Each structure stands twice: as C-alpha cells, then as structure tokens.
Amino acid sequence: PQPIRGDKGATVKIPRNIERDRQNPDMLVPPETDHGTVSNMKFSFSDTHNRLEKGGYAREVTVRELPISENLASVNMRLKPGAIRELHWHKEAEWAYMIYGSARVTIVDEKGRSFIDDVGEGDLWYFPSGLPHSIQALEEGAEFLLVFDDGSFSENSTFQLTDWLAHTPKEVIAANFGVTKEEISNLPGKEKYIFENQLPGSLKDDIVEGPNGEVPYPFTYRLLEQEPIESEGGKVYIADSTNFKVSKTIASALVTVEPGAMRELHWHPNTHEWQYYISGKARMTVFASDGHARTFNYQAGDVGYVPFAMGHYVENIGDEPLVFLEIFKDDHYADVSLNQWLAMLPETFVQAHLDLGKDFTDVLSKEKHPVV
Amino acid sequence: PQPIRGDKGATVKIPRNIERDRQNPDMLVPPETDHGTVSNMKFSFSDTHNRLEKGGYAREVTVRELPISENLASVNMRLKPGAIRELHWHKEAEWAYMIYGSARVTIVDEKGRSFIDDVGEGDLWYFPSGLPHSIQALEEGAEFLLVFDDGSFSENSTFQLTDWLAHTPKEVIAANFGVTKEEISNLPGKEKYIFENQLPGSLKDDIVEGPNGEVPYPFTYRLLEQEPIESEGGKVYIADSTNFKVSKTIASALVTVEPGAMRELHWHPNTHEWQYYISGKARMTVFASDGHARTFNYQAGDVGYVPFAMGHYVENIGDEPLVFLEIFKDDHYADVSLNQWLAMLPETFVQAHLDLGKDFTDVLSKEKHPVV
Amino acid sequence: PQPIRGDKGATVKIPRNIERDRQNPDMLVPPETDHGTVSNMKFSFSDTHNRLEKGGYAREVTVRELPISENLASVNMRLKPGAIRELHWHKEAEWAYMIYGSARVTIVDEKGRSFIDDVGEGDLWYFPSGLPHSIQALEEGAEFLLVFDDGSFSENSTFQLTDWLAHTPKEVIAANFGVTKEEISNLPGKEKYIFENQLPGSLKDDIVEGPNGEVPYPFTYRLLEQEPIESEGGKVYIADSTNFKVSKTIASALVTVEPGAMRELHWHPNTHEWQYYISGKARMTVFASDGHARTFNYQAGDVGYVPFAMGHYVENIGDEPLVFLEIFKDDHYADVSLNQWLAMLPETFVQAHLDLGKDFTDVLSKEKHPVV
Amino acid sequence: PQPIRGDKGATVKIPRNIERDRQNPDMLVPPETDHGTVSNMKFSFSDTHNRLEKGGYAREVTVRELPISENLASVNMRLKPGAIRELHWHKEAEWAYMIYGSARVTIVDEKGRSFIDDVGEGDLWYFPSGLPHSIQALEEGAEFLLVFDDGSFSENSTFQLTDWLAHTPKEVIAANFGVTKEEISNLPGKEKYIFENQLPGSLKDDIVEGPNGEVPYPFTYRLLEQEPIESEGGKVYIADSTNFKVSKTIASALVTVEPGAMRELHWHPNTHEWQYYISGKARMTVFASDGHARTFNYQAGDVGYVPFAMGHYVENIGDEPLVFLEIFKDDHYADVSLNQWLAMLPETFVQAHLDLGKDFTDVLSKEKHPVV
Amino acid sequence: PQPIRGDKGATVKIPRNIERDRQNPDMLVPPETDHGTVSNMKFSFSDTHNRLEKGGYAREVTVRELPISENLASVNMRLKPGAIRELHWHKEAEWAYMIYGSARVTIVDEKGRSFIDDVGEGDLWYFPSGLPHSIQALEEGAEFLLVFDDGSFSENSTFQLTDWLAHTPKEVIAANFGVTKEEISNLPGKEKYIFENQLPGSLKDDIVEGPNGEVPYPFTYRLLEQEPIESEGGKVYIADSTNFKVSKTIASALVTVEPGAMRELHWHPNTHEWQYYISGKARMTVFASDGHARTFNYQAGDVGYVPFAMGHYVENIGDEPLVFLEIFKDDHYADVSLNQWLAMLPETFVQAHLDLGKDFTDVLSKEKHPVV
Ligand SMILES: [Mg+2]
Ligand SMILES: [Mg+2]
Ligand SMILES: [Mg+2]
Ligand SMILES: [Mg+2]
Ligand SMILES: [Mg+2]
Ligand SMILES: [Mn+2]
Ligand SMILES: [Mn+2]
Ligand SMILES: [Mn+2]
Ligand SMILES: [Mn+2]
Ligand SMILES: [Mn+2]
Ligand SMILES: [Mn+2]
Ligand SMILES: [Mn+2]
Ligand SMILES: [Mn+2]
Ligand SMILES: [Mn+2]
Ligand SMILES: [Mn+2]
C-alpha cells in the first residue's frame, strides 16, 4: 500500500511498518474530506504491556495510552479455570462484558447484603464505586472487558484484601477480629491479585444468607436475552440505568453490523462515547466541527473514542460481522440520527439547506434505524 | 469630566478617551466606599468583532473577552427577513430572549420528536445541549440574545449540518441514505451558517407529524404573558425550571427599573449572575467581601457579571426606563433581600449590629420588593 | 523516646522536639507494616494562628494547612457570654457541633422565612450555602467546631453585614431603605466580626413571625437525643440528610471509643473522611493501596483525614474515652466493614484468600459492630 | 454606522452604543478577510476603576481585564506636583514611560547602593523585581505608564513601607533600630500609597553617598535622545537590554506613525507584544495562523496585544500622528519584516509562491523600513 | 504467540490482533522483572492520519498521540522531486534529519540575513523559533523527520506565507509594498502548504546577497561527516549546541547498533529522551524508580520516549542493524553509564552493594562504551 490518492501523496521511501499500514487503509490514505487537527481516537490492547500471573493475565488502556479518554479506562482480563481475581475494591465504578467463558462474582454492599451470581458470554455486571467484589472463572475459564469510570485508572485505584491485611499491624488485626496474633500468623505477606484455585461448586451452594436481607437490585444483567433493536443491517442491545438499574454511571450498547452495513450517521447529545471492537474490521470518520474531521480504522481488540456531540458513523469494511461496544459515562443512552432528524423537518426547509430536491427528502425516514 | 472627588484625584494630562469617560462616570470617579482589587465585571458588544453574513450578523462576548464569566457566554444575533441560521447543534445548552422581531425555531429531540414554533418579542427558547435546532426570521427580521452555559463557547462548540456533510465521504453519505453519489453531487461544499431565504408560510403548515408523538414540554416560553412581581419602582419577570420546564440549566429574570428606582440590595445564594443590559443606563457596586467593592457603569448593549454570593444592587441613573436580564446557570432563581433579611430578625438584634435605633428598624419590610 | 524498632532505626543526635515526639509514638516509631509515600493526614489547631477579638476567638485548619483536605475546612470558634458572631453569609455550606456551652442562632432563607433556635452541647446546625445567619453565645459562653464544604475556605469566603454596608454608597443605602443619609450616619465604619453584647432574653420572645410562614425543615439537630449504634467498645451517633434533612452536603458521625477499644477496620465507598478529635488519644493506619500505608497519632484538638476508599481503623491508645467526629461531604453516611464483608462470603472462599482455616472464619460476624 | 459590508450584514435593530460603534469602525464592519475565533486583543483604561488619592490617581489593565495578556500588566499613574508614590517594592519588575511632566525616582539595590534621578517626558526607568523604589512628581506634576512583567499584577504584588511597619510589632521595630517604643509612637497606622508633599529641592542636593559605591548601571534611560530608526512614514526608538542595560525582562519601542503611514507587516520571533496607544487612532489585523485573523481598532488610552509570532501591522487611520508603545517581556527586541524576508529570497521562488511576476518582486527591499 | 511465561499467563481466547502481537513479543510476554504502572512510551507513525497533498505528504506524532511526550513533537514529511513546503514559520524551534534524498532550505533571520543550503542524507538543520523558512526537494525527492520543541505542536503552531496574505486586507498589502490592489489581484486565495514545482537550479545560483552580511552560524549540519564514538557493538554521532552551534534547544544522537549488540544501560542527568526508530527492531526496558519498570518493543517508524533520569538500554533484537535517534530538549547531550559509574568507585564499595565479588568488579571499564 502507498499513501497516494489521485494526484496527491507519494510512495514511502524510508523503512516502514507495512503490516500496520495494511491495517490502517483509511489512515495511510484518508478520505479527501478529512481535514484539520484531530486528537488520536484509537489504541490497540496489543500495544500494551500484559501483566501475567499464575491464573491469567490483564492489560489496560487508560488516559496514559489514549489521552482523549479522560473519563473512561479499560482492562482486558483473562482467567484460567477456577482462577480467582482477588477480593478487592476501587474508587471507580466497574462495568463488564463477558466475551468468552463464564465466571462467578461476589459483591457485598454498604448494608452488609451480599450478591453472588454466575455470568456467561453476553452478560454484564456493574459494581458501584467502593463496593468490594471478586471474580472466579468457571470450567471454561473466562476473558472479559472491564470499563472503569475514570480515565486515570491505575494501580492506586485498586485495594486488595490481602494487601490491606499485609500492611496493617498484626496486633490491630488480632484485636479487630478477637483472635491472637498466632492465629493469623499464616496471613499472606503480599497480595495475590490473581491466583489459581480449584473450581467452585454449584452457585446455589455458595449463596450466603444474612440478617440484612437481599440486595434491592441485581449487579448482573443478561444483555443478549432482551429483544434488540433490529435494523436492516444489524442489531443493537442497550443496557443503561433504565433497564439495568444499578448501572448509574455507565450506559452501554452492543452493536452488530453485518457485512455491507454501517452504524448510521449520528451523534450523542449527552456525553463522550468510548468503544471496544470485539470482532471484525471497520472505519469511522469523526466530525469535530468547524471543518475538522478525521477517519480511523479499527479491528479486533482496538479501543475507540468519540468526544461529546461529535458526528460519526461506523462502517463494516470486512467480510465478517462487525461487533463492538459503545460505552457512555451517563445514566442513559441517547443518540440523534441524522436521517430521522431531517425526516422530521419540513421538506422544503431541508431542501433549502442541502440544495437537493424532493428526490432526496423522499428517502428520509421518521423511524430510527441504527444500522443500515 | 475629570477623575476628581473632593480633595482626591486630579485632572487627566495625557491623551484620553473622553467619550468612554462620559459613559463611565462612576468608574472615572468611583464612590468613596469602593476599595480593593476586583475583577472586571463589564464588557460591551460594541467592543467585539461582528461576523457579517448574507442574511444578518453575530457577535459574541465570551470568557476570552470577560474572564470572570467562565460558566456563561453570549451571542447577539441579527437575522434579516426570511434569513436562516443553519440547522446545527452544540455541546452547550442554549437560552434566548427575542428583543426585536420574531422567528420560527425547530428542534428535534433524541426520541425523534419535533417541535416547531414562532417566537416574538419578549419570548424565550431553551435548547438542551446536543439537540439540533434552527432559527428563521419572519417578516420583520429578528435580533435576539443567546446565552450558552459554558464561558468557553467558541467555533469548536457548534456543528453545522452542511459542514458535517461536506466533511463526510460521499460514498458514506450515499450509503447512509440509500442513494447514489450522483444524487447528492449538489450538496454544499462549505457550511452556510446564516443564509438568505424566502419567508416561510404559516406555522400550522410547517408542523410535522411523527410516529414518536409530541414532545413532553415546550422549548419556547412567553415570558411577558405571565404576571410579573410588581414593586413600587418596577417589575420582574422570572423564568426558571419551575415554570419553563425544559430550562434546567438556565434561570432568568427580566428586570425593568423606572427612572429614580433601583433593583434593591441583595445577593444570590445559589450561583453567579450574568447580565445583559437591553436599554437604559445604570450603575452597580459589587461587594466581594473582606472590604472589597467596586462600582461599574452599564448601558445599552453591555454584559455584566456578579460572582456567586457577592452583594449588589442595580440603580437606574438615567431618565429612561432601565431594562436588563439576570441570568443564572442553575435550575432555579433565588435571592436574599437585605431589607427582608433584617426585617425578619429581632429588632434589638439588628440595632446591636448597625448602631442605629428603632427609627431605622421601623422602616424594614417583611415582604420582598425587588425594585424600590 | 528514640526512633528504634528492633534492629532498625537509631537514637536522635541533633536538637529535637521531645514533647512532640512523645505525642507521636507511632510516627517516631511506626509499625513495621507501614510503607511508601503517603500525604500528611494530621494537623493540630494548636499549630494555627488564633484570631482574638473582644468577645472570643477563632482559628482555622484549611487546605493551606492540610493540603490533602481540598473539600473541607474547619474553624474552632469560641464566644464569651452574650458575644455575637456578626450576621453574615458565605459561599460554602456550614455544619457545626457544639462542644461546650450553648448559643442562639438565626437564619433566614431565600423565601424570607426565619428560623431562630438555641443549641446546646451535643447539638448541630447546618446552614446551606449563601443563607445569612448569626450566632450569639448564651450564659455559659460557647465553643464549637465549624466545618465548611470547601477546603479553600478563607477571608474571601465570608460576607459580613456591616462590612457590606460600610462599602456601599451612603446615598444608595438611604435610597434602598427610604431614609436620609443623616439617619444612617451612625452605621459602623468597619465590620464587627465578633463583638461583646448583653445576654439575650428567652427564645420564645425572639421568635419573629412573617407572611411567608415557617421553614420546611429545622436547621438544628439534637444529635445526642437519638439512640446511637451501640457496640461492645463504644457508640456511634450518625446525622446525615436521611435524618437531619437540611444537611445535604455534610454527613457526620460522633464516635466514642472506650479505653481498650477501637473503631473497626473499614472504609467508605462514597467519599473522603475528615476528622476532628474532641478528646482522648488515638492512632490510625491509613491503607492507600498498592502496598502503601502510614500510621498517624491524634489527640485533643487535631484534625485528621482519610482519602476516599482508603482502609482504616481508629484505636484508642489512652486511658480515657476517645471521642471524635467523622465528617463526609455527601448526602449520606456509608461504610463497609471488613469483618461483615468477609462474614457474608462463602467460608472456603475467604479461607482460600487468607490461607487461614475454619477457626478464623468462625469468628466473623454478619452484624456490623462499628466499635469493638 | 451600520454593520453592513456589501450584501452582508444588516442594520442594528436593538438599543445600542453608537459612540463605541463609531470608535470601532473595523470591528462593527470588519475586513472581508477576517475569519475565525480570535481572543480579544484590546482594552481601554477608560473602562477601568480609577483609584483616587490625595495627590493623584492610578488605574490598571491586568489579566483580569485582558485575559490574553498573562505575562504583562499595566498601570496609568498620575501624580500632582510634589506628590509622592510611597516607598515600596513588588515581586514584579517595573518599566515606565513618562508621558507628561517629570518626577524624581529613588531606588536602592541589594548591595545598599542608591540611585536617585529625575525623569522627564520621553524618559524611561526600569526597577528590577524586589528592589525598593519611590516616585515624586516635580513642579508640573506627572503622568506615566507603568508595565509590570506578570499579568496577574494586583494588590498582593506590592509592599508599602508604612504598611509593613504598621503590621510589625512595635517592640520588634524598636529593637530593630535601637530606639524605644515611645520614639516610634507616631508611625502611621495605615499605608499612605500616594500622598501630597512639598516639592523637593535640586537633584544634586538629594544625592546620598554611601560606603558601597555607585550602582553599576543607571535605572533610567533617555529614550528620545538617541537617534531613532527613521523610515519614510515615521520613526522607531528602541530600548532593550542591549542599550538600556538594567532592563533585562522588558524590551520596548516607541513608534510614531505619520498620517497616511503604517507600521509594516511583520511578526516577532521572540515573544508576545503588549501595546499602549499614547495618541492617535489605528487599526491592526492579527493573523493567528490556520486561516484565523481579526481586526481591532485602537485610540488614545487603549491597551493592545499580539500573541507570540502572530503576523500584524498597525495602520494610522486618523489625521494626526499615531504614537504607541510596543512592549516585550524579553532581553531584546526582534522582528521579522515580511518585505525584507521576501526581498532576501530568490525572485522566482517568491513568484512561485505568490503567483505574481517580476513586477512585484521588483518592489521588494532588502533594507528594513519599520514604518512605510 | 501466546501471553505465557512459565506457569504465568494463558492463551488468548477472544478475537485478537495477531500481527501486532508478533511485533510486540516483549509486551505480550514481558520480562519477569517488569512491574508497576508505567505510561505508554511507544507510538507508530503508521497509526497516524497521513495528510496527502499534490507534491507529498506529512504525518505527525504529538502529545495528542503520545501523552508522555509533552515537550517534543514530530512530523514525518515526504516531498516529491521539486516539491515545495511553503514558506512559513512557527512558535517552536525545528530540528530535522534527512533520511532519504535531499532538499534545499532557506531561512532569513531577524537581521535580514539569509541562509540557503542543500541537505543530503545524514544531514540536519535547525531553525530557531519564529524564523521563516522553506524546504524544496531536489531530483530524488526527499523524506525526513522533523522534531519541534513543544509536544502540543499543531495546526495553530504554523503560519504560512500565502495564508497570511489571504487573510490581510488587500488595501493593506498594497500599501505595505507600494503597489495597487490590481497588481496583487492574483495572490492565492488559500494557502499552498505543499505544492509541486519545477526542480531548482544550482545552489550557487540561488544565493542571495544582502546589505546585512552573512549569518554568524550555519543552520545545517553534516552529522555523518564527523568521526563517531565507535564502540565494539556500534557507533554514535552526536550533535548539540557545542558543535552544531545554532541548535540551542535540541541535542541529538544518531545511534547504530549491530546485530547482537545493545546501547548500554544508562540514563540522562539533564532531560527527557525522545526517540525515533529509523530501521531495525529493538526492545527497551524503562526503569521508573521505586520498583517500577516496563519493557517496550520498537521497529521502523515508531517513536519512543524515556522520561528524565529513568534508567534504560536499547537492545537490537533483529538480524539487521538497529538505527535510531535520541533527541533531547537541551543545549547539550549528557549521559551516565552504569558500567563507567561503578568502574569509578572503590571495588569493595561496589561489592558491598551488589553482593558480588572481585570477579564482577574486574570486568568494569573506566572508559565509556555506548554500544556493547
Ligand atoms: Mg474542509
Ligand atoms: Mg474599606
Ligand atoms: Mg509493604
Ligand atoms: Mg479564510
Ligand atoms: Mg519489583
Ligand atoms: Mn474490580
Ligand atoms: Mn455512537
Ligand atoms: Mn444554536
Ligand atoms: Mn442579582
Ligand atoms: Mn457562618
Ligand atoms: Mn471512617
Ligand atoms: Mn513600583
Ligand atoms: Mn510588532
Ligand atoms: Mn517548519
Ligand atoms: Mn538514552
């Protein structure tokens, strides 16, 4: 491939990364309509350090990797069968999508109520900031995407149970529980983070009963069970605080785009959009106002971003289905469709703007079709 | 005029701007009670660049002009008869007051519901952040004041319909609507922003029906229709989220002060006050605490500002009525009257503070009179 | 005392402050488990400038003294019998705890409604931001702790009644009230702030009736009247917006820890904790995640702080009861108990984490006991 | 005047400030070539609060008035005959230009060396940061422009001699000088700032001799004595650290533009330009790159600004001479002339850029002519 | 490849980017010694938008792509034979390395002196901030790396000649040069940026003579002509202000590492290191102190970064030579070699630190060998 478009551009003369150029066709050779300075809106998990542990791994994309995403950060975590992500808590709220396998999660709220449940492929969970939780993969192991509502998410964001105890005077721990220092002499000297463990038993056998009762709302959500918004070119599954009650700071949508289809031109009137590409290949042009626009390519891993109110679309440029997540730090999902917008205005008024005739306004639809 | 007060000050000896000195009597010669460093709280639209277009003009006062106003910015827009302010949207919420003429506005919400209505002198509109809208002046043309809830409002805040399409690949636009590239070959190459157009027909003929139903609440408000708070020296018309339902981030008040009257000494316990002087001449002293106070003069255009909780009053120093707007970035209007405050406390307690007698406390009123 | 722990440390060889070293046993000789850089979380009112006035005094601990506390600041105020803290208002909300004596407070809201009441030892008050108020000590005088919801609280935060009038043109004041300049010639030339005054009469005689009616909710709260959460080692009295209705930005808890007891290991899932030590002596280790932890000593005065979500405990290390306040800038109090958390999880799962057996999990309690 | 240019713009329909519109012809009706968002680069001293004292006055334009000027602030000070600007010092360096009258200044350096001298119209002075100084007007009184090298210049920037003593324990002052508290009982209770005083005697009689010798370099500079750069349309007098040795942080140029002339198109490769218009009327277009440019009008007072490297010119649009100051926070003056730049490049290369022929390149001059 | 190291890690179960994983062996499977949160220190030009023009292209890596690099930004520019990078200037200083081909550059300083010269492969140029310049490729075309001393480098950083004129009133341009508006009617309406042009003639024929004389120092430097520091595993060519006189804000080093060799363990005691990989493949571990370290992989394009004082090395992990640039925003190059450091200390002292014997200290060298 060469950076040539018509009579513009030229061949690359210096040593280059041909493999990456092939993955970014629309960046090596952008649309003629691209223009102006626009921040980077793409980053691959494959370009991050992978923390390997006995029991799995974890890699992250944060504001230190993708500066534009100051409000959201993400971790791609993998657990082997039975492996446990140590009991912990953080300052940020946590949202997750199970891509592969399954796992059992636990969480106890500020009123001493516990919630334990199994999560499979296509399911989500949301843990409010500060509430302690854990994850343990089941027989197939597990690999999921975590999203935290602070782009600065880092090592100083998470508190591990064993790390806390390892840094608390033995005499204080003893006094706190009413035991002797000798009885807790075997406590770990360092945190575990992720550790191998035998597979757990049936969920029903793990349920713990308490004097505080059951939690008011579930911390897990079966996203694929609900009926999706079905368009001619694909489908959209949405989960925000209106249906997944506890998810107050994260609204999400799983979008599937068939080959030859595209997520239509639209924008979000509420907040920034954070994206994760599960599978497939795509291209998206972000319109940043005042004649500024830049096109980006995305595939598999890849994290994407669309700043608040910027116009965009997501086109499948591959032969396989395109599947990605749209994440928003808000209590609801909201979007404005270009097609629907114009369809709901007087025909001659739209014609006056576009210098087009009735032949164009005749194709506008008053019904919203997310994927065409 | 000379900067002389009693035995203080002196005549100006260097070349000067006599015209401006005449407009700022209380700045050239401030009250003896003024003291300390206080930020500038005044700026004139006449001191800004006027963007002229075929169909009208627009000038703005932002944080780049008035640094103290970081949360609110304003645009003075003028449209000729039939002229259209191109379909667009922005990150900020928009509030407006029609000073002269009338116009038809359109807006479509995130659920595909449209609202179209005509706005006349004394009417307002409020467009939630991110929702697309337009303005088209009627037979008398129109001139209004726009207020956006972010002082950094600029060119990167607004997204124009034709600018978006002009910066989107033709093949993508074609695919989005299901037409050929040839059918959209006549789309504008650049945005229009403001453009001349034939006057529209009757409002009833423009109303568009849709499968999503009518909007829950109107985006326009007839401010002058309601009964105002009538005081001995003037009247106050208030519009906040309690009566103009959709206006959640902007609370407003239209104040009219007759000659020889004044908006009484008061402060706002909720947020900063942004002002626009429609007509007349005035002076206001802002009390910034810790013995700091500065007096400013205002007239016609002029934008004013009163930081959160600072004490102030607005005195008419002219022969004609004084008319101005008080704007607040909040979901409600709130103020504390000095008179009412003292009137609601034990008489001897107030006397103990002011070193004054019953003769003074006897004039205090338990009823609030905004303009005396 | 010497900074020696086992074979670590050494004797101090340079001139030193032995008195302070004696007050900070756990800082001169920290637990072996302390580690890493942790910001200072302690400051004494005795290390601040005391503003002395005719009628009392006031000293403060703000972000300029304790940098970690950016959201909360405090003032220790003392009033002699009958002394008045001048009518004033500020940008910040104000919360208070009467430690000694009693006082009468007044406050008028934005609707012209007044609230006057007497506050005794153990009582609280909360004045919403911007609402004018006053304090006048009764026959025993008064000494209380004030907490403002902005760590930057300073001189530019408070507006005094007489200071406002002293910096307002006489002709404007006259016009505002409808009197002559001669009638207000005796107004103070400078603010009073705190001034001596004769003791007031009975509360019932001070109550002012108005055309706006009574306030919807009281601005004072009798904290010690309610039944506290009683544990084996002490008690906790909580006051947040769920019971003390008007206190929307401040949640509080008065904790009493008997000798030999401790506020258990816990953390707050909602926000930072600000502390004030009323009496006694203690030590607290703050766990800041990622193997970081630091221990601090506190006594009498002393202000403490625990950043959001950090693990902590408060142990009484003296022979007398330990009494302190836990303050949070939020509309509710919330905490997660380490004991309760583990008690509500499957036993073998906890055992897998701690490398401990049934003997340990058997002591866990599903009921929360704040002080053990 | 009306905001109309050809077929663009329209008449103003709302109440307006006709006087200011007349002063800003190029802002009400900007050049067709103006475009994009550009910060405000103009502010009038007449729009500022004038501090009046017994002996003169002072008004300032700081970053609180003109946000773009973060590195430089200015004060317009006026002193009556014999009046003294109290002995003081500040954190910022101070540069000055005597516009009217004359004054005697004093300054003592960190080595105890004193410098006393008289300054007349056209003379300058530069006081390094932190060095104490004073100003006393002579028989004609004085009015000058002060420039400080920090845009945040305010009340907290200046330390007055009597204010320091007024806030130092009497016993400490006594001990410091070896006198009794009784001997200093008459010290002022408050600062003087500016105060009336009898005219001083001859300069030679005020010169103080010391054991530390004379200062290495003078703190005053006779700008108009040197030969200026004389062009066909005016002249330029430059004073920077290369000729006015002590002026290390301020470089200056006094520019005079005859009617029908203009300061040529140029830019500064070193730093931002701060301007003060002494007399006349002008217009300047600032080119901010990327197709952004805005035109401003200036007259008498007025402060102007040109951010670092932006292209500009200053055209006299009046019938009288245009006189202004160009100030730079740097140790040298530097500029690049558009004409000279192109004149020093191959002719065909310039022709290739401008699409113009030899007829144009033939008029280019290799010699720099600041004012044409 | 799989993220597995011994008994740590696991196979990837979700869709992935195998191509990128293959390019980042040490990121997918980091050294066991890596630990802690470390910012991203790598970015590929292939992952950026390529601006294509008639005559070449340009792509950039700025702080918007690589957040850690706040002080330096870079552009990879390509010019076809004879193509011109339009006459322009910027706020930032510019440094360049010619990787392929050759070009003629022009620059005029603030004294009207011009410098024109040809630059070939291995040559550099440095243009001080604000000084106008141009680049025109010769018969082979050209491709080079530009480095600007501000990470925020963007569109608002560069001023183009034709863009300035296009946004300046025609009447002003006419007056500035003494021509009629008609004579300049053919000036471009928009900037050119990069445009095709006929190849220039011999350099000697382009040299322009002026009344200001020759520039004091050359703006170009033949880096490969000088004798490099030759080590056993490679060579280092250094150019800083001590030899390339005008390059005051950029110090550089071209490093060549043979297969099986490595840039030794070292750190820089002066400032941050910015890197560009010309050819080959490598891996570098950055030691960030306090037990934090992260390994990164680099190849062809790729930009790297090493924050101030962090320890590092650069190992060739390929079969071909590794060639990269080390750039520093400082007036000199400086480094501390771990080997040399220990070699210059008492043997037993080093042994006491490392718990190693004479066998190790015996291999230390007092001479610095950059590449081993
Ligand atoms: Mg464009
Ligand atoms: Mg005062
Ligand atoms: Mg440790
Ligand atoms: Mg333009
Ligand atoms: Mg380690
Ligand atoms: Mn988690
Ligand atoms: Mn979207
Ligand atoms: Mn709008
Ligand atoms: Mn008000
Ligand atoms: Mn208070
Ligand atoms: Mn706590
Ligand atoms: Mn001074
Ligand atoms: Mn200039
Ligand atoms: Mn350049
Ligand atoms: Mn290095």
Side-chain angles (χ1 to χ4, degrees), chain A residues 32-36 290-293, chain B residues 163 166-167 189-190:
Chain A
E32 184 67 52
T33 46
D34 269 19
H35 181 295
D290 186 46
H292 284 63
Chain B
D163 192 29
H167 292 82
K190 296 182 178 180

Side-chain angles (χ1 to χ4, degrees), chain A residues 273-295:
Chain A
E273 177 180 308
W274 184 93
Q275 319 172 318
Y276 177 66
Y277 289 83
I278 298 173
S279 58
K281 299 182 178 180
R283 77 166 178 173
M284 161 180 79
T285 297
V286 297
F287 175 57
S289 89
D290 186 46
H292 284 63
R294 185 161 299 190
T295 301

Side-chain angles (χ1 to χ4, degrees), chain B residues 110-365:
Chain B
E110 74 275 36
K111 295 179 178 180
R113 298 174 296 198
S114 74
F115 178 83
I116 303 181
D117 190 34
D118 287 341
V119 175
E121 289 172 14
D123 294 346
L124 323 172
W125 72 61
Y126 177 91
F127 304 145
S129 64
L131 299 189
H133 52 276
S134 67
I135 311 166
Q136 175 172 30
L138 301 183
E139 73 291 330
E140 292 299 327
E143 184 150 20
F144 42 98
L145 182 76
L146 299 169
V147 180
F148 301 94
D149 64 0
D150 187 319
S152 297
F153 183 77
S154 68
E155 47 181 35
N156 305 303
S157 297
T158 307
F159 301 82
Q160 260 73 57
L161 169 63
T162 58
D163 192 29
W164 185 14
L165 292 167
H167 292 82
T168 303
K170 285 288 186 174
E171 50 182 33
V172 173
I173 299 175
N176 187 262
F177 292 105
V179 301
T180 60
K181 297 166 64 180
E182 296 60 59
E183 287 180 289
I184 54 178
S185 62
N186 203 52
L187 283 174
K190 296 182 178 180
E191 75 175 8
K192 297 192 174 191
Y193 186 63
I194 286 179
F195 60 104
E196 306 265 37
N197 196 271
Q198 183 180 311
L199 284 167
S202 299
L203 175 61
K204 64 180 182 61
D205 297 306
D206 274 353
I207 307 305
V208 183
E209 204 71 293
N212 292 293
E214 181 184 300
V215 300
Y217 298 104
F219 291 100
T220 55
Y221 191 77
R222 307 293 310 300
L223 184 59
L224 301 181
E225 292 195 306
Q226 295 68 55
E227 187 180 303
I229 294 175
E230 187 169 298
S231 297
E232 186 177 0
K235 52 184 181 178
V236 183
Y237 297 87
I238 299 175
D240 61 22
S241 81
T242 66
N243 60 331
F244 184 14
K245 303 298 184 178
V246 303
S247 193
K248 295 182 177 180
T249 67
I250 294 290
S252 60
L254 174 66
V255 187
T256 300
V257 182
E258 291 303 298
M262 66 178 269
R263 172 77 176 80
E264 70 168 353
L265 285 163
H266 68 287
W267 77 85
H268 301 288
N270 59 331
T271 189
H272 315 285
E273 177 180 308
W274 184 93
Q275 319 172 318
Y276 177 66
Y277 289 83
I278 298 173
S279 58
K281 299 182 178 180
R283 77 166 178 173
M284 161 180 79
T285 297
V286 297
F287 175 57
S289 89
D290 186 45
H292 284 63
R294 185 161 299 190
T295 301
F296 297 90
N297 286 117
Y298 301 96
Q299 70 180 68
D302 290 356
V303 170
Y305 202 82
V306 183
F308 174 42
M310 291 193 31
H312 59 292
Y313 67 87
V314 187
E315 166 177 37
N316 187 342
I317 59 176
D319 301 303
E320 302 298 309
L322 167 61
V323 184
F324 65 93
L325 288 167
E326 304 177 319
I327 305 296
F328 309 85
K329 185 175 177 180
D330 203 354
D331 62 6
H332 68 98
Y333 175 85
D335 76 311
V336 177
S337 161
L338 173 60
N339 197 318
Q340 184 175 60
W341 170 29
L342 304 183
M344 295 291 51
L345 297 174
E347 193 163 56
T348 60
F349 190 60
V350 172
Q351 284 166 33
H353 279 75
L354 311 182
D355 298 327
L356 297 183
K358 191 171 183 299
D359 287 309
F360 178 75
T361 50
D362 282 332
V363 308
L364 300 178
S365 172

Side-chain angles (χ1 to χ4, degrees), chain A residues 266 268 273 312 326:
Chain A
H266 68 287
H268 301 288
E273 177 180 308
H312 59 292
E326 304 177 319

Side-chain angles (χ1 to χ4, degrees), chain D residues 263 266 268 273 275 312 326 328 333:
Chain D
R263 172 77 176 80
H266 68 287
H268 301 288
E273 177 180 308
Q275 319 172 318
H312 59 292
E326 304 177 319
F328 309 85
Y333 175 85

Side-chain angles (χ1 to χ4, degrees), chain D residues 86-214:
Chain D
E86 183 183 350
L87 282 157
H88 67 278
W89 75 93
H90 6 71
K91 304 188 299 299
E92 304 89 339
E94 176 182 311
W95 178 96
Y97 179 77
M98 185 65 49
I99 302 170
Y100 165 84
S102 57
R104 181 164 304 168
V105 299
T106 76
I107 184 176
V108 177
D109 63 24
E110 74 275 36
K111 295 179 178 180
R113 298 174 296 198
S114 74
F115 178 83
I116 303 181
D117 190 34
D118 287 341
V119 175
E121 289 172 14
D123 294 346
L124 323 172
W125 72 61
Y126 177 91
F127 304 145
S129 64
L131 299 189
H133 52 276
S134 67
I135 311 166
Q136 175 172 30
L138 301 183
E139 73 291 330
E140 292 299 327
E143 184 150 20
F144 42 98
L145 182 76
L146 299 169
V147 180
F148 301 94
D149 64 0
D150 187 319
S152 297
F153 183 77
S154 68
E155 47 181 35
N156 305 303
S157 297
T158 307
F159 301 82
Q160 260 73 57
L161 169 63
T162 58
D163 192 29
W164 185 14
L165 292 167
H167 292 82
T168 303
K170 285 288 186 174
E171 50 182 33
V172 173
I173 299 175
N176 187 262
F177 292 105
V179 301
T180 60
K181 297 166 64 180
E182 296 60 59
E183 287 180 289
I184 54 178
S185 62
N186 203 52
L187 283 174
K190 296 182 178 180
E191 75 175 8
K192 297 192 174 191
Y193 186 63
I194 286 179
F195 60 104
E196 306 265 37
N197 196 271
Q198 183 180 311
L199 284 167
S202 299
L203 175 61
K204 64 180 182 61
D205 297 306
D206 274 353
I207 307 305
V208 183
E209 204 71 293
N212 292 293
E214 181 184 300

Side-chain angles (χ1 to χ4, degrees), chain D residues 58-76:
Chain D
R59 43 187 176 184
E60 66 185 11
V61 174
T62 72
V63 71
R64 297 179 293 286
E65 286 65 61
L66 187 62
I68 193 67
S69 183
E70 297 182 351
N71 68 334
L72 295 159
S74 179
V75 171
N76 165 22

